[PDB]
RNA sequence: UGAAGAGUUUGAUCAUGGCUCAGAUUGAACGCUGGCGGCAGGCCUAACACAUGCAAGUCGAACGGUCCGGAAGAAGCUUUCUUUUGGACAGUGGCGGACGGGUGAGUAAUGUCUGGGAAACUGCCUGAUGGAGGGGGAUAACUACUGGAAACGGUAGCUAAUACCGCAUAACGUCGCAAGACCAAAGAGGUUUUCUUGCCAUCGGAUGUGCCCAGAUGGGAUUAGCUAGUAGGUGGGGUAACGGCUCACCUAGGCGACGAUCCCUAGCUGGUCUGAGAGGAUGACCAGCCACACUGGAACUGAGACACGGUCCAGACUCCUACGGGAGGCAGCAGUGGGGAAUAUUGCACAAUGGGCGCAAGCCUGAUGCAGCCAUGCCGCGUGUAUGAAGAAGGCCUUCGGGUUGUAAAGUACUUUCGCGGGGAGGAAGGGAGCGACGAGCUCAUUGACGUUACCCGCGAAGUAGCACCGGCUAACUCCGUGCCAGCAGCCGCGGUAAUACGGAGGGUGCAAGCGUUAAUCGGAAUUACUGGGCGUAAAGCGCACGCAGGCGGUUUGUUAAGUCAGAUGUGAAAUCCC
């Protein structure tokens, strides 16, 4: 089942997530279908805490792609 | 896919073997090498005889060894 | 060493003495060892004195002894039954000798 | 680093490196101009490899840096465009500990390295305690507000008055600050080094 | 933007030629030594045998009893007992173990890689269309009895559903001919005339696969003729499906020096190391695929496992045993013993991220996040800083005049890693409650392993260093001892009384908690040379002829245009590499 969740590039004291759409089977940090944006928990690296690219996910959503609870929050924030 | 070859045998019925030949460069040396392959093409009309240079196209598997069929004859004969 | 191993254990078959070649003269101490590799080779015994008996059982390092043709290996002192040289105040790294107090 | 008798290195290199009291008439190179040891007297015999070796030696000794980083910095300068020789000194001269020395905050590079490690030196506000820090142009290197009181820098900066600074630099004794104008060229630096020889040694 | 060679076969020279060297790397080990911290990393050797614990459940919005808990009754109190209700276990009933995790034994084959084809299939989830009328039947629990040491088992009686079955409508679909006939389906919960969860049939979406095909995929021919279903045809059987896949009959072919057949070996790849490139080597960490769980074989049930904690049969072994008969299988985690040169805490924890089930609350989750041990590696830091004699003492050398180790130590001043005190982190919102129709939305409240660690502030003592080497390549020297004796040695060699190459000492060079040693990988080798080579005498034309296959082929014109060349487009996963 295709799902839109957060991929953790996360490094030591460098936690960054990549809201991506991919098969629920694949690993958390495996081959993803396509990146729709990014998330910075601390929002320290850049002022732009998150870039959703609404139109993009707006497509996957309705295509059968389901969004996780956490990702849904970020996406809902648009 | 279309392949050109010679009719090296018309012994079987409705079945003719076409000896297709090609030229490819050696992966190491690069010099052109000769390579051929025999394909059992279908010929319901038993129209093609031995020596005929015919064209061969991919078609619905008639048999296990036959997955090609005679399309058109290039030249009349060359033994 | 067979399995390209740095070292190889083995059991001594006989601890006899050998004489150097044309240019040299002495009673070099060697010993036939039956390594686990399945080979029975002769190894040299460095040091001024050793305590290798018949059932010695020692590790082989590997080294040719120019004077003794055939001896292509050296015994590692300080390992197994091969006691390290006594009173070695010098190169203790070799001969396996703990630094005195 | 090395940490040991520096006054002996000057004799070995033949040239007089500025480690400390190089100004005073004490600097052994003033008394006995021969390398240390019981053989510093007999006539030495140098080979092609020797001249290149001793050459880079004095070079690295001046900045008092390890042979590793020194080599690493060499590789870098050799990668970037422009004459390697020039770039070389540029990088080594870019070291924070070195800059501080050039600014006069420290009597020598060794003391400068200490000042940096002691967090007694800042860069563009934020403090930096890494001697290997690469100072870029337009960067301001001043003393710590809290360290402005320590007698050591008080005496160092005091002697700095009236003393000229390199063209690629500019200090303000009053504010006890400093600015890195640009990367110093080989023309600006007057080191007893022959960059053409140090580059050959690493060739091999 | 990319390429230095040197030593040694001579009395000397040139050439040919082999061997060898300084560098970098290694999930290493060994020797001497060893302070701290961060990140990373750790049986590379037997599928050898294993003590002990642990490695999947969840639902009372499917139904009847025990265990744990609360509340309300009959009582003056006690005993006893009744009703209601929460959790859960035991049972019945429903949905889930073929995912994840481990290992590489086996494996040359469309197994894999790359590019295509079609004779196919796909739970839960999503979109669309239509429907859900009437009836019938069954088995445990439970109850009673009997057998057994135990495991567990036999018999009798009662009983329910979204459990099973028969009948309707035909949206449609299937079959013959052509333009005909046949075949379907369970409720429950409530803010209950309105929604919620769920069901039946069909089409489509999403995704994942079975099968087929072109090309590519190691070594040996002291492995050459091989083959009977063996090659093809008709019909049939069989499967989700093609196919001799299997069968009957007929035909007699099919394959091979572009190497079949046989034998040997090794999981493969993305990538990794190296190299100027080509290429060589490798594929260990991580990611994809494949193949394996006491040894061997097999099938069932299912969308899927021929399935580690499912089943059946054969075999050995271990344990239990009233011996009648049973229980298992760490190549799962940790660990034990055995092996080896060698590789670790039978630790902490779920809050965070992710996963399974559930409407939800919530439950499960040694997956993982961390700590521990080891300089195994990488990076950062400290053992102090400034001052201090034409120049102590001591050791060493001496033409004993003196020189050297030395500003080096002592000593003076300064800072002050450890340690102590205080403070103390990021990494994490809802369930609920209030407003609103307990919906959308808004508002508010409660709660954390590593840690009391990181980090900040205050106080504050100078407070481990070693190892290798000094004939030449290799940078760095003398004295004494020994004396071809003892010993050294990668190669050339050295030692028979003056040795910078033996041992010690002083000194010196290199490096630094590291330093050496051993083993393994790379080029130089233009020494297989495609780029880069040779064959009269240094290694090298086959003794000659004829001739098959194969390779190559004169001048002009035309067609095709396969090779070749050009434009566009698709593919060329991520990561990596380069900027």
Q: How many whole angstroms separate alpha carbon B7 and alpha carbon B79?
A: 9
Phi, psi of D73 (to 5 degrees): -60, -35
Q: Is strand E less than 7 A from the beta carbon of C78?
A: yes
Q: Is the CB of D3 under 7 A from strand E?
A: yes
Beta bridge partner(s), residue B70: B56
Beta bridge partners of D170: D179
- Collapsing DSSP to helix, strand or coil, D154 comes out as helix
Distance in angstroms (rounded) separating the CA atoms of residues D100 and D63: 12
Q: Could you check: is the Cβ of residue A44 within 7 Å of any atom of nucleic acid strand E?
A: no
| Residue–nucleotide distance: D38 CA to E7 C1' (Å) | 32
The integer distance in angstroms from the CA atom of A70 to the C1' atom of E187 is 36
Phi, psi of D152 (to 5 degrees): -50, -55
Whose structure tokens read 């083995």? C10
A42: Cβ under 7 Å from strand E? yes
Strand E contact with C4 (CB < 7 A): yes
Q: How far apart are CA A60 and CA A2, in angstroms?
A: 9
B49, B7 Cβ separation under 8 angstroms: yes
Q: Tell me the technique behind this structure.
A: cryo-EM
Cα C7 vs. chain centroid, distance in angstroms? Answer: 12
What is residue B54's three-state secondary structure? strand
What whole-number distance in Å separates Cα of residue A17 and Cα of residue A21? Answer: 13
Through-space separation of residue A68 CA and nucleotide E430 C1' in angstroms: 15
DSSP E strands in A1-78: the ranges are 2-8, 17-23, 34-35, 38-39, 50-51, 66-67
């Amino acid at each position: 089942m295709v799902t839109i969740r957060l991929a953790r590039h996360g490094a030591k004291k460098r936690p960054f997530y990549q809201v991506v759409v991919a098969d629920s089977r694949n690993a958390r940090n495996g081959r993803f279908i396509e990146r729709v944006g990014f998330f910075n928990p601390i929002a320290s690296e850049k002022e732009e805490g998150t870039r959703l690219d609404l139109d993009r996910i707006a497509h996957w959503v309705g295509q059968g792609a389901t969004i996780s609870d956490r990702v849904a929050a970020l996406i809902k924030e648009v | 896919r279309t392949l050109q070859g010679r009719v090296v045998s018309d012994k079987m019925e409705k079945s003719i073997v076409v000896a297709i030949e090609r030229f490819v460069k050696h992966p190491i040396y690069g010099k052109f090498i000769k390579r051929t392959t025999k394909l059992h093409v279908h010929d319901e009309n038993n129209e093609c005889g031995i020596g005929d240079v015919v064209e061969i196209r991919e078609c619905r598997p008639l048999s296990k060894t036959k997955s090609w069929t005679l399309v058109r004859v290039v030249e009349k004969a060359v033994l | 060493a067979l399995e390209a191993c740095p070292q190889k254990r083995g059991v001594c078959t006989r601890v006899y003495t050998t004489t150097p070649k044309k240019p040299n003269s002495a009673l070099r101490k060697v010993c036939r060892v039956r390594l686990t590799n399945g080979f029975e080779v002769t190894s040299y015994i460095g040091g001024e004195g050793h305590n290798l008996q018949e059932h010695s059982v020692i590790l082989i390092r590997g080294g040719r002894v120019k004077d003794l043709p055939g001896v292509r290996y050296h015994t590692v002192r300080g390992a197994l039954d091969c006691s390290g040289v006594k009173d070695r105040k010098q190169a203790r790294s070799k001969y396996g000798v703990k630094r005195p107090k | 680093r090395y940490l040991g008798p520096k006054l002996k290195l000057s004799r070995r290199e033949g040239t007089d490196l500025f480690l400390k009291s190089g100004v005073r008439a004490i600097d052994t190179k003033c008394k006995i101009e021969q390398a240390p040891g019981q053989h510093g007297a007999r006539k030495p015999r140098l080979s092609d490899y020797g001249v290149q070796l001793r050459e880079k030696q004095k070079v690295r000794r001046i900045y008092g840096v390890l042979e590793r980083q020194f080599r690493n910095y060499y590789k870098e300068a050799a990668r970037l465009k422009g004459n390697t020789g020039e770039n070389l000194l540029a990088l080594l001269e870019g070291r924070l500990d070195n800059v501080v020395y050039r600014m006069g905050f420290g009597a020598t590079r060794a003391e400068a390295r200490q000042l940096v490690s002691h967090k007694a030196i800042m860069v563009n506000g934020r403090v930096v305690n890494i001697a290997s820090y690469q100072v870029s142009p337009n960067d301001v290197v001043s003393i710590r507000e809290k360290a402005k009181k320590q007698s050591r820098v008080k005496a160092a900066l005091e002697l700095a008055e009236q003393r000229e600074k390199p063209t690629w630099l500019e200090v303000d004794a009053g504010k006890m600050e400093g600015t890195f104008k640009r990367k110093p060229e080989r023309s600006d630096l007057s080191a007893d080094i022959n960059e053409h020889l140090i580059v050959e040694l690493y060739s091999k």
